[PDB]
Amino acid sequence: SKRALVILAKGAEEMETVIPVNVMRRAGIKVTVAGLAGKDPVQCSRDVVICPDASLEDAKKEGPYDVVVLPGGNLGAQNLSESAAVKEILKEQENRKGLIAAICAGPTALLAHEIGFGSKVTTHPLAKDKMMNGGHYTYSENRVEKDGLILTSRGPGTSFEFALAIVEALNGKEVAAQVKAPLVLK
Amino acid sequence: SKRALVILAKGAEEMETVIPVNVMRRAGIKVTVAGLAGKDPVQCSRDVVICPDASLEDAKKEGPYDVVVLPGGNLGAQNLSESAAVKEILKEQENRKGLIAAICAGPTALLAHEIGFGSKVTTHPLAKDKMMNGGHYTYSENRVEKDGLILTSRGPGTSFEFALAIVEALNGKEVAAQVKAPLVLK
């Protein structure tokens, strides 16, 4: 089975955490929700408290992963951007030609860690200027953007599209379509 | 501020829990996530573990609520349907002419507790036959259905529509529109 690492920091957008985790699990992907700070519960942006499966340290030992997923939320993304452990994981994933997926403010951690320069990316509209500082990426307004192994998306309301794009990249279009149908998406 | 009670049982659909909680908090609603079983963490349908704000018992004491929200997930809804405490809360809410909102399999707990008979309702397609046993409701295929104080919806992919309908009912159309825009919904 494919494997996904979802890195969960304080201040993460909980919709952008839970929608990808759940949809990837519906696709039969083995997902590890890893707490940036440790195994303790994480207070998300709108105060939902989620208990991670593992600390990031332990989850790293259990790699490699077919995708590393970065939720958004301004403060969650700032915490991801400040983390040396996140830097190391993303560099490794990039070096092994593995998928990296980030949503809303999440892509700004790619900038912080110098990941995927020269890619077309999207972000939340409000995170554009941060992402574009230095002109290291080309901006897109697509709801989901995928430039090779860098997969980005815009906001809570693009989270299902984002998650299904991850499923398609890992498990193919037919599995994505089968996972999509019971969701009652428009 | 308006107040919402979200009742969280083992096996709840975590997307249908988190999307309404987060969107209602964006709308300035004071939301209490109450654990059916107690204050301990809840293992949702796709294994996301959420820590409730309170036990339901304590949250009841802190009522009344402007809305009671029932997430879906087959097993979560079964747990809600089996609960005498849920029965009592829903009967009280109905008696005081307060809104009740339920999504996916969640509406089947209205049937179990004899709430809102004679209403037009929707459910997940797979929960239709359970909901319709006895012909106590009239079925709808609308993505969100609202018949007075009974507000229902279909699935994970209708959760934003459902949550925004709750916000409109409580705080009005303008607040709903202002909350909606930053979400990047299609």
Cα of A20 to nearest chain B Cα, Å: 10
Q: Please state the domain count of chain A.
A: 1
| Method by which the model was determined | X-ray
Domain extent at residue A58 = 1-186
A30 touches B: beta carbon within 8 Å: no
- Out of A18, A45, A158, closest to residue B15 by CB: A18
Q: Are A159 and A153 in contact (CB under 8 A)?
A: yes
Question: Where is B101: in which H helix or E strand?
Answer: strand B99-103
Cα B111 to the center of its chain, rounded Å: 14
- Decide if B156 and A183 are in contact by the 8 Å CB cutoff: yes
B87 Cβ contact list (under 8 Å, min separation 6): B112, B113
- Number of neighbours of residue B24 by Cβ within 10 angstroms: 27
Q: Are B13 and B71 in contact (CB under 8 A)?
A: yes
A64 touches B: beta carbon within 8 Å: no
Question: Which value in Å is the resolution of this experimental model?
Answer: 1.1
Contacts of A182 in chain B (CB under 8 A): 124, 126, 155
- Catalytic residue positions of A? 104, 124
> What b-and-e string marks burial along B85-109, b requiring 16 or more CB atoms within 10 Å of the CB?
ebbebbeebbeeebbbbbbbbbbbb
> What b-and-e string marks burial along A21-46, b requiring 16 or more CB atoms within 10 Å of the CB?
bbbbbbbebebbbbbbeeeebbebbb
**Distance of alpha carbon B120 from alpha carbon A16, whole angstroms:** 32
Cα of A31 to nearest chain B Cα, Å: 10
Structure tokens at A113: 């860690």
Nearest to B42 by CA among A98, A44, A51: A51
**Distance of alpha carbon A121 from alpha carbon A159, whole angstroms:** 15
Contacts of B183 in chain A (CB under 8 A): 155-157
Task: Report the CATH number at residue B13.
Answer: 3.40.50.880
- Decide if A15 and B18 are in contact by the 8 Å CB cutoff: yes
Question: Where is B162: in which H helix or E strand?
Answer: helix B159-171
